[PDB]
Structure 1
Amino acid sequence: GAPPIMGSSVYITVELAIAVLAILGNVLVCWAVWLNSNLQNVTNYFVVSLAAADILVGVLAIPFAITISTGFCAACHGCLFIACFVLVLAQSSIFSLLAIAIDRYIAIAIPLRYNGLVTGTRAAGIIAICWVLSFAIGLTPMLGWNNCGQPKEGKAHSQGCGEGQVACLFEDVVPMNYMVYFNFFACVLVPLLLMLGVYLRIFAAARRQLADLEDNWETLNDNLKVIEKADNAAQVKDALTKMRAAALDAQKDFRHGFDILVGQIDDALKLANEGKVKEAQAAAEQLKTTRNAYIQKYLERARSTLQKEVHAAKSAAIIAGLFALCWLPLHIINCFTFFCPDCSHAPLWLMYLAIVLSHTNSVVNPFIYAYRIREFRQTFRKIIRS
């Protein structure tokens, strides 16, 4: 049994290193959003709320975790607060991650009404509401779902604790049925699964819209070929009518290009209906000039916008997946403790790895933004250089 202060020194030193990096990186995120108006959008207000939670992991939750690792004597309800505050920050993170996913889904699924639906003032209200709900969820043990009514008196007496005091240890004061059924299953697992469903819908919507763009492009070029090798006016008419409905479907300098295109289709359709096949086919050949000068530029720009949305949704999904990767080990350990009382408790070294891993999640987001979002990376460079 090596002196506890030795392994404690390693744990504390690692925690302090994580706290420093979590503060510095997420302050940099908040500084970047404040300074750059290209970063001031609803999506990034949730990013800032998420960075604020991670700053508070460094400033408060990590000091609280160090404190409660000592088992020091404390009034049980005071011990509850330092045990549970991190649950508020994790819950706020969950709400921010879910909001980011939903925001990106609205942007990809109804972009025409996004800006009118998703506003900065509405985002700020949602963030306020989510922080209040995070306090209610994370501090629910302080409302009475706690073990303060059944203190471990032998542990308190062995440490010289005063009257009404307990040895302040997370698993002695926070009930494990709360941690497993309420916190993990209901408040963490269900929102993460909802996030997964939203991201699946985002990527499926992007895939469908890109396919729809390519289908309309092929229909345009296919029907032009049909007109060229048509042998009567009715065949020309058939292909032009299919082109006209498709042109309006793709319309839902951009406006000018489609105005020319639909007009040139109408010109050829009128000639077709007069039985002037050769003249209609010549009129339809003009469509190619409009296709090259206008329509192809719209196709490429629409594709480029969708691909950027896919890239941004992947970046956001990486953040959500890394949250799950960092927090799941601690939750899984709690499940073993709760569901398997015949199993030996996870060993002390694994406890400290799982706790430290959950704290490292507050370090990682600034790096994801830097490596994946040019506007962040460039703003980070300007802040650091200056």
Structure 2
Amino acid sequence: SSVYITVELAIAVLAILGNVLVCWAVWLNSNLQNVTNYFVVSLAAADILVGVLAIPFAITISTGFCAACHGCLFIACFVLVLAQSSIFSLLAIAIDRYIAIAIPLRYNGLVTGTRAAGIIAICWVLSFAIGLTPMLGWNNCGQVACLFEDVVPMNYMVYFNFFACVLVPLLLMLGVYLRIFAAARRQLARSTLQKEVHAAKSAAIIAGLFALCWLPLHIINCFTFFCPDCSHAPLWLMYLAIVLAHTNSVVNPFIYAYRIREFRQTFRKII
């Protein structure tokens, strides 16, 4: 119990620090203000909020505080909007890499800073609508005690939250990355191509780490929903899955530092 709170607080601190470093690095350095880096800083902002609010909210839900219904749904479902925003940002990054690699000549024409910010705003607005759907409808609410099992319907999680809003973007961007690397192999000028592949590899790792972290908890929810005859998953397994899902927030600043040389140099400059 106490171990969970301590590890969650440590994850929150690490996420805040790493992603504020990423945001500061992109803001400070003009060489790092690409089109893809706008999606990168949107994803960093999503991780910052995961650290600042989503993890304290998870701790409070673990304590099972009683409160009003709508506040309870907001506390339980704030992680959902941030995960969806991360999904949308990762998809935008994958499509940007595909545009940059498959059609380099018209890449600058197709994607523009104003277009990038627009897509970011639309994706952020859609993430709130998808994640906070329980507040509008689909409630098991009927001061209710805040338990994520009792309050948030599992039909929502296993159909709308997961099958349409995670697996579909996950599989689409898996196909996008496969097409990216197939086109990279077809195209092989050589110096520029290896920069695109290296950038695509870096942005595909942070995608692979996201799916690796989130599918444990999603599959546990699917097991809870599809087969009611079997008993509920153990509490320790549930907390481990939550911690694993939260761990994806801290990893990608380290990936940027390790893979992207400009990020590493400006990180060392900041510190």
TM-score range (shorter-chain normalised) is over 0.9
1:326–1:361 CA contact under 8 A, matched in 2? yes
CA–CA distance in structure 2, aligned partners of residues 129 and 15 of structure 1: 30
Shift of 1:109: 1.3
- Tell me how far 1:72 sits from its aligned partner: 1.3
Query: How many angstroms does 1:208 deviate by?
Result: 0.5
Deviation of the 1:210 alpha carbon: 0.2
Count of matched residue pairs: 271
Deviations 1:88-128 (A, max 9, x none): 00000000000000001000111111111101011001101
Deviations 1:231-271 (A, max 9, x none): xxxxxxxxxxxxxxxxxxxxxxxxxxxxxxxxxxxxxxxxx
Whole-Å separation in 1 of the counterparts to 2:110 and 2:200: 19
1:114-263 pair list within 5 angstroms: 114-149=107-142, 166-210=144-188
Instruction: State the Cα distance separating 1:149 from its structure 2 match.
Output: 2.4
Contact kept in structure 2, 1:77 and 1:148, CA below 8 Å: no
What CA distance in whole angstroms lies between the structure 2 residues aligned with 1:120 and 1:143?
33
Q: Distance in 2 between matches of 1:169 and 1:17?
A: 23
| 1:57-105 superposed Cα distances (whole Å, 9 cap, x missing partner) | 1100000000011111111221000100110000000000000000010
Higher relative contact order structure (alpha carbons within 8 Å, sequence separation ≥ 6): 2
Displacement of 1:304 after TM fit? 1.5
**Does the 8 Å CA contact 1:97/1:320 hold for their aligned counterparts?**
yes
**Any idea what the Cα deviations from partners look like across 1:352-383, whole Å, max 9, x if unmatched?**
11001111110000000011100111111111
Structure 1: unaligned runs, 5 residues or longer: 1-7, 151-165, 212-302
**RMSD of aligned Cα (Å):** 1.3
In 1, Cα distance between equivalents of 2:48 and 2:267: 17
Distance in 1, Cα, partners of 2:187 & 2:66 = 61
Structure 2 counterpart SS, 1:131: helix
**Quick one: distance in 2 between partners of 1:115 and 1:366?**
26
Which residue of the partner structure matches residue 213 of structure 2? 326
Q: Check conservation: 1:65, 1:83, Cα contact below 8 A.
A: yes
> What's 1:153 paired with?
none
Q: Distance in 1 between matches of 2:69 and 2:150?
A: 10
Matches of 2:23 and 2:40 in 1, distance apart?
A: 9
User: Cα deviations across residues 20-50 of structure 1 (Å, max 9, x unaligned)?
Assistant: 0000000000000000101001100000000
After the TM superposition, list the runs of 4 or more consecutive aligned residues in structure 1 that deviate by more than 3 angstroms.
none
Cα pair 1:180 1:331 within 8 Å, conserved: yes
**What is the deviation of 1:343?**
1.2
Once the two structures are superposed, residues 117-159 of structure 1 have per-residue CA deviations (whole angstroms, 9 ceiling, x without a partner) of 1010110011011110000000011111111129xxxxxxxxx
Alpha-carbon distance between aligned partners in 2 of 1:341 and 1:179, rounded to the nearest angstrom: 15
Partners of 2:232 and 2:196 in 1: how far apart? 45
Percent sequence identity over aligned pairs: 100
Give how far 1:169 is off: 0.8
Alpha carbons 1:108, 1:205 under 8 Å: kept: yes
**Whole-Å Cα distance in 2 between the matches of residues 199 and 73 of structure 1?**
44
- Cα offset, 1:308, TM superposition: 1.6
Partner SS for 1:146: coil
Q: 1:66 aligns with which of 47, 59, 65?
A: 59
Corresponding residue SS for 2:106 = helix
The alpha-carbon deviation at position 311 of structure 1 amounts to 1.2
Residues 284-324 of structure 1 deviation map (CA, whole Å, 9 limit, x = unaligned): xxxxxxxxxxxxxxxxxxx1211121111111110001000
Distance 2:181 2:247 in 1: 28
Alpha-carbon distance, 1:167 to partner: 1.3
Measured in 1, the distance between the counterparts of 2:152 and 2:224 equals 13
1:51 aligns with 2:29: no
Partner of 1:364: 251
Q: CA deviation at 1:10?
A: 1.2
Following superposition, the deviation at residue 17 of structure 1 comes to 0.4
**Residue aligned with 1:149, SS:** coil
Q: Which has the larger radius of gyration?
A: 1
Structure-2 separation of matches of 1:111 and 1:306: 10
TM-score (norm 1): 0.69
Question: 2:210 & 2:230 partners in 1: Cα distance?
Answer: 27
Superposition deviation, residue 174 in structure 1: 0.7
Q: Which runs of 5+ in 2 are unaligned?
A: none
